[PDB]
Design a protein around this nucleic acid. Structure first.
Ligand code: MG
Ligand code: MG
Ligand code: MG
Lengths: 114, 99, 49, 144, 139
RNA sequence: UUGUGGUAGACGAGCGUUGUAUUGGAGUUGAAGUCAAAGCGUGAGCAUUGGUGGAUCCAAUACAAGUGAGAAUGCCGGCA
RNA sequence: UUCUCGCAGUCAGACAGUGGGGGAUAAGCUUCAUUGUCAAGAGGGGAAGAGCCCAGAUCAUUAAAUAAGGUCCCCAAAAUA
RNA sequence: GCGAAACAGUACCGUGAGGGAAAGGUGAAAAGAACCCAGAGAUGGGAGUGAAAUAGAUUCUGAAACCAUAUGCCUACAACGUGUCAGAGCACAUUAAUGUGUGAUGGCGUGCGUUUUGAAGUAUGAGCCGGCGAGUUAUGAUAGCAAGCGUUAGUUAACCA
């Protein structure tokens, strides 16, 4: 018994090529390059799915530092004024968003002054 | 007006009539769930949590997020393992918040 | 006993196919190691040796 | 999952400024200028929209460098040729070209980036008190 | 309302025919026949005849207006090739490949004629989604 | 409750292909194959609709193998 | 990690700390005993580094506290004396 | 699959012994496309036959690499293993989905197999696509698992019907 099987190979390569669309040049045409680029893209996806929560926290810190620097104290002093006194688990983003709807944030920053 | 609520493990800034997506809650469509934990309801800041304060939401749907197809591949060392993931979520909106 | 569904109890064991990729294991080297005398065709010198 | 963080986009509004760099020092002025240009101090800093303000620096030649640097630290500039090192000293930079000094000291503090070359053009360093940018109605603040 | 005309396996290159086909495309027919006759190219004596034949096909067969015509869309697709051997120093026998071109010229009558192709494109997906939806009634 | 990085390498459970057997069954009211699409799976892989095409084919359980390709200055054909 | 049975693979190692030989208290040198790491191992520090320091990745989260290292700007984070 | 489905040991290479290929399918049936227009003509476009002429003699189907055309979006101060995570504006509207195509701009980012102590590698292999292509078989040995049969057990080979 002889088995040729050109169906399965083409279907597999078609899936790999379909994965990489919107790629420059031949990367979406030739399969040999498409597989390399899909592998590399998924590596980058795995690394960035961690780097982005590494970075968004930093952005929230930055936009909280800026808001507090216009009241007379720094972010590195505000965190004490949440943990030790008036123990609060308000998150590190929402205290950021509260500036985009301000004058409810000022209530926070003057509440810890007690 | 606003409120800050701990649903799942993420804290949410939530007003009236807003739809937000949280992690799976094990509750069928249409029922009302009272999220219990809450901090900073309205100018009223509970230090550990705001006691005797809830936010009442109606669950809209259970869904699966977009597929994340993770392939990990040691370079030039005989390894091409592949795995896929569809994190389930629940979308739900608020009706009003218990004072 | 319904030849349309004929089943045994247990005899169909893991067939180590040696050269069909890595996911099954036993792939490119095929269990022969790396680059020795045994790696080449017809290794395994005389039994008592 | 969670509520997506808010991020302004083409919602930028930028107000001019004026600082009279009479007796400040180079670097302490430069970090403040760099932050004011980047809009790092804005309450809503979107990292990719040039949300920062404009800036005009006046009386450049009066800025001061601490210590004996005026005779010991050199600024270099090289053409792509050979033997093209142009090497000038702090005393000569505070006289011949002073605005270029503050300009360069500010530019290097910005990231290697594609808005950095578009940020830096928001810094206008006039050498003397007079200017032609009174039309834009700047504010005025001390030591920034 | 297109009335094309095609010549197959002309002994010209595809890449030399595309140079004058660019000249003729998008322009009116009165300033195409003459502008193509007057240019000094081998790829012009081979396209003047074809363009005039397309004119005649449009005018006689389909019955269009004529002085409203314009060259809708011009190409020189790759026709079949010929393979030949060429001697060399020391007998190395490179392969010369003679080219060819399947020229085709389309002559439209209404000035737009392009949104109609897009309309057919959109219908071909509208019917796909519609057949998809009518088969969602599997309950 | 304790765990879940991993080459060589040991072990386990599996997908797919071609055909035979019996069992069901779809097909000119359009079969396989082929492209396209904004689906479903933990993976190998699997459906749905439409255009083309113009006669064979799909699922369940066993069985048997020329059974699974990105690399061999690989072979053949085509094309840059 | 002891005993029996089936099945292999391996026998070109490298560097850092420590104690010595050869070497010239020369080598990213060579040969050993030892502790690690890499190999076969990603992340953070180190500007950039396979082998140093911290650590040991089931997958998703636009959650919180930390280790080495670090807080004028690039680059997240500090002030007083 | 015989080297060979056809005028193959042909054509072709070689002084000679000898070496030695490739390619098939209209349709049910030629009803092989009279006639008209352009053109020198092949041919093409209508007509005509026919179920279909995107079946037309280039003749079953007709992927990919490859070459051209076109709606939609971006790009002419920009350092780029070319993608990813964020993200504007723009244009559409689906296997109804926290949707689709492009993606100004920020952060981040030295390919795949091989062999090596260690390679992005100034070490090597691959121009690209498709197809072909590499642990099987006979007869015995030992081990594991399952089954039949069992304590004077078990078991056939050749051969014959
Ligand atoms: Mg090898
Ligand atoms: Mg391989
Ligand atoms: Mg070489």
């Amino acid at each position: 018994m002889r088995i040729k099987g050109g169906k399965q190979t083409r279907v597999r390569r078609k899936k790999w090529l379909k994965q990489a669309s919107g790629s420059f040049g031949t990367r979406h045409a030739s399969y040999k390059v498409a597989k390399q680029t899909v592998i590399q893209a998924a590596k980058y996806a795995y690394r960035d799915r961690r780097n982005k929560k590494r970075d968004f926290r930093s952005l929230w810190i930055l936009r909280l530092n800026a808001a507090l620097r216009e009241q007379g104290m720094t972010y590195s002093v505000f965190i004490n004024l949440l943990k030790k006194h008036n123990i609060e688990i308000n998150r590190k983003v929402l205290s950021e968003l509260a500036i985009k709807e301000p004058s409810k944030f000022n209530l926070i920053v003057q509440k810890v002054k007690s | 007006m606003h409120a800050i609520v701990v649903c799942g493990s993420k804290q949410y800034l939530v007003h009236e009539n807003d739809t937000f997506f949280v992690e799976k809650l094990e509750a069928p469509v249409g029922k009302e769930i009272q999220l219990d934990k809450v901090l900073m309801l309205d100018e009223k800041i509970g230090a550990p949590y705001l006691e005797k304060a809830r936010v009442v939401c109606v669950v809209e749907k259970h869904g699966l997020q977009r597929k994340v197809n993770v392939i990990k591949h040691i370079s030039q060392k005989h390894h091409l393992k592949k795995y896929g993931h569809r994190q389930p979520y629940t979308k739900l909106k608020v009706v009003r918040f218990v004072h | 006993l319904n030849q349309l569904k004929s089943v045994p109890k247990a005899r169909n064991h893991k067939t180590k196919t040696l050269g069909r990729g890595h996911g099954s294991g036993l792939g490119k080297t095929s269990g022969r190691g790396q680059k020795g005398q045994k790696a080449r065709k017809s290794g395994l010198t005389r039994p008592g040796f | 999952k969670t509520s997506m963080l808010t991020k302004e986009q083409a919602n930028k509004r930028r107000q001019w400024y004026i600082v009279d760099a009479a007796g400040l020092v180079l670097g302490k002025l430069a970090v403040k200028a760099a932050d004011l240009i980047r809009g790092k101090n804005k309450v809503d800093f979107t990292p990719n929209q040039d949300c920062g303000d404009y800036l005009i620096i006046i009386n450049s030649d009066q800025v001061v460098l601490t210590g004996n640097k005026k005779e010991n630290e050199f600024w270099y500039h090289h053409s792509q040729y050979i033997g093209g090192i142009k090497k000038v000293s702090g005393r000569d930079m505070l006289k011949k070209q002073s605005d270029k000094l503050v300009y360069n000291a500010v530019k290097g503090m910005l990231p290697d980036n594609r808005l950095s070359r578009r940020w830096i053009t928001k810094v206008h360093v006039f050498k003397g008190d007079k200017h032609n940018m009174e039309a834009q109605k700047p504010t005025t603040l001390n030591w920034s | 309302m297109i009335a094309f005309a095609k010549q197959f396996r002309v002994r010209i290159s595809p890449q030399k025919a595309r140079l004058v086909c660019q000249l003729i495309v998008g322009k009116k027919t009165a300033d195409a026949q003459n502008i193509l006759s007057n240019t000094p190219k081998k790829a012009a004596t081979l396209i003047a005849k074809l363009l005039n034949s397309a004119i005649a096909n449009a005018t006689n067969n389909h019955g269009m207006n004529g002085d409203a015509l314009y060259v809708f869309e011009c190409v020189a697709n790759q026709g079949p090739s010929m393979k030949r051997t060429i001697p060399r120093a020391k007998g190395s026998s490179n392969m010369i490949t003679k080219r060819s071109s399947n020229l085709v010229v389309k002559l439209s009558d209404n000035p737009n004629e392009r949104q109609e192709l897009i309309k057919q494109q959109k219908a071909l997906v509208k019917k796909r989604v519609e057949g998809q939806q009518k088969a969602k009634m599997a309950r």
